[PDB]
Design an enzyme around this catalytic site. Structure first.
Site, PDB file in Angstrom:
ATOM      1  N   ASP A 140      37.231 -16.815  12.867  1.00  0.00           N
ATOM      2  CA  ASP A 140      36.494 -16.839  11.618  1.00  0.00           C
ATOM      3  C   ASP A 140      35.084 -17.320  11.926  1.00  0.00           C
ATOM      4  O   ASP A 140      34.757 -17.676  13.060  1.00  0.00           O
ATOM      5  CB  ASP A 140      37.180 -17.715  10.563  1.00  0.00           C
ATOM      6  CG  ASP A 140      37.129 -19.200  10.879  1.00  0.00           C
ATOM      7  OD1 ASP A 140      36.591 -19.581  11.931  1.00  0.00           O
ATOM      8  OD2 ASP A 140      37.640 -19.999  10.049  1.00  0.00           O
ATOM      9  N   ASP A 186      31.940 -19.780  10.222  1.00  0.00           N
ATOM     10  CA  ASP A 186      31.635 -20.812   9.238  1.00  0.00           C
ATOM     11  C   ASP A 186      30.139 -20.993   9.069  1.00  0.00           C
ATOM     12  O   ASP A 186      29.415 -21.098  10.062  1.00  0.00           O
ATOM     13  CB  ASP A 186      32.215 -22.148   9.687  1.00  0.00           C
ATOM     14  CG  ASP A 186      33.707 -22.083   9.874  1.00  0.00           C
ATOM     15  OD1 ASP A 186      34.362 -21.598   8.964  1.00  0.00           O
ATOM     16  OD2 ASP A 186      34.204 -22.447  10.949  1.00  0.00           O
ATOM     17  N   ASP A 215      33.925 -18.659   6.116  1.00  0.00           N
ATOM     18  CA  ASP A 215      33.903 -19.803   5.233  1.00  0.00           C
ATOM     19  C   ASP A 215      32.463 -20.133   4.886  1.00  0.00           C
ATOM     20  O   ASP A 215      31.624 -20.231   5.784  1.00  0.00           O
ATOM     21  CB  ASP A 215      34.559 -21.029   5.863  1.00  0.00           C
ATOM     22  CG  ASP A 215      36.020 -20.793   6.221  1.00  0.00           C
ATOM     23  OD1 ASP A 215      36.695 -20.090   5.471  1.00  0.00           O
ATOM     24  OD2 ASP A 215      36.457 -21.350   7.233  1.00  0.00           O
TER      25      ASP A 215
END
Ligand SMILES: [Mg+2]
Ligand code: NA
Ligand code: NA
Length: 326
Positions: A194, A196, A250
């Site tokens: 992912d 961020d 995120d």
DNA sequence: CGGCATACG
DNA sequence: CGTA
DNA sequence: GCCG
């Protein structure tokens, strides 16, 4: 000499004891699957101690005195050095329970307690879950729908493309607002699962209400597959040549007064941050989170301008992000 | 013996 | 519960 | 599982 807390020692991204640490991390993961967060933490801490050592462990003697090495973790290392394999680790690896719990908990929206319930109900494969959509939350449905893409490593080129579109939306939503890459990529990882980003504005208070405006602007450009405040755990539709892939992103908004605390928290690693917060409270009597550092006797918050300020106040030698890979 | 990070969605 |  |  090896300090007991992970936040007291540098841990580089590349280290010399991968085989031993990976074995201990299997046992940690398995402890988590059985609901033993204390055993998980010890095995994680022991693995992290090996990552901080300057050279390969080649003899059991080299573990003497190391923190978080007791009879169990030492025996695992002993069997790996003597034989190249640890029976307990191999038993766990090959077990249906471990393999299925790993499969299910890798889904976005599914943790240990959900995976364990499904396991006890006899479910074993992703197709089994798809066959019973009523048992799935909206978050889990999105995790399962995009599971193949989400299992594909995110690369730096993806990060750079995502940072540009996030910067464009942030700048449309609030002039002067900034976007900082955090997470594992800030620690120097070349891949991740992912991406961020931490968003702020130099004028305290101007960032109020920002994240919904950013999400609207991203959704209107067709960039959001899933979302749903100051933290958004999204799945983006990232354009690729002739196509697209889903990527977990995120987004976090913090007021600038909190920015160093949020940057520290969101840069990780997870073990580093748990250890740093444990050190803060248990050794220094101060309460640390991603918003601030609180002295509960004076009832005051420490004003920090940088991560370095936070370390120094805790009495810790500063570690740059690339040495926080605990 | 009991603790084990600490938040937000 | 899930997320980090 | 290890430690304060
Ligand atoms: Mg993330
Ligand atoms: Na999960
Ligand atoms: Na990350």
């Amino acid at each position: 000499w090896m300090p007991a807390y992970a936040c007291q020692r540098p841990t580089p991204l590349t280290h010399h004891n991968t085989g031993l640490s990976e074995a201990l991390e299997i046992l940690a993961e398995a402890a988590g699957f059985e609901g033993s967060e204390g055993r998980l933490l010890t095995f994680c801490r022991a693995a992290s101690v090996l990552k901080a050592l300057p050279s390969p462990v080649t003899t059991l003697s080299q573990l003497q005195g190391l923190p978080h090495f007791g009879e169990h973790s030492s025996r695992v290392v002993q069997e790996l050095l003597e034989h190249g394999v640890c029976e307990e680790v191999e038993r766990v690896r090959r077990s249906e329970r471990y393999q299925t719990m790993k499969l299910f908990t890798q889904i976005f929206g599914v943790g240990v307690k959900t995976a364990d319930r499904w396991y006890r109900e006899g479910l074993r494969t992703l197709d089994d879950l798809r066959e019973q959509p009523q048992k799935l939350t909206q978050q889990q449905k999105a995790g399962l729908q995009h599971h193949q893409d989400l299992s594909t490593p995110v690369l730096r080129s993806d990060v750079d493309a995502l940072q540009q579109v996030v910067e464009e939306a942030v700048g449309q939503a609030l002039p002067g607002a900034t976007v900082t890459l955090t997470g594992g990529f800030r620690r120097g990882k070349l891949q991740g699962h992912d991406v961020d980003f931490l968003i702020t504005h130099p004028k305290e208070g101007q960032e109020a209400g920002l994240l919904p405006r950013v999400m609207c602007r991203l959704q209107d450009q067709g960039l959001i597959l899933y979302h749903q405040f100051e933290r958004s755990f999204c799945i983006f539709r990232l354009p690729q040549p002739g196509s697209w892939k889903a990527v977990r992103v995120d987004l976090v908004v913090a007021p600038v007064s909190q920015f160093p605390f949020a940057l520290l928290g969101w840069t990780g690693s997870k073990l580093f941050q748990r250890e740093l917060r444990r050190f803060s409270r248990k050794e220094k009597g101060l309460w640390l989170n991603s918003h601030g550092l609180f002295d509960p006797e004076q009832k005051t918050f420490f004003q920090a301008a940088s991560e370095e300020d936070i370390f120094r106040h805790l009495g810790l030698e500063y570690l740059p992000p690339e040495q926080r890979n605990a």
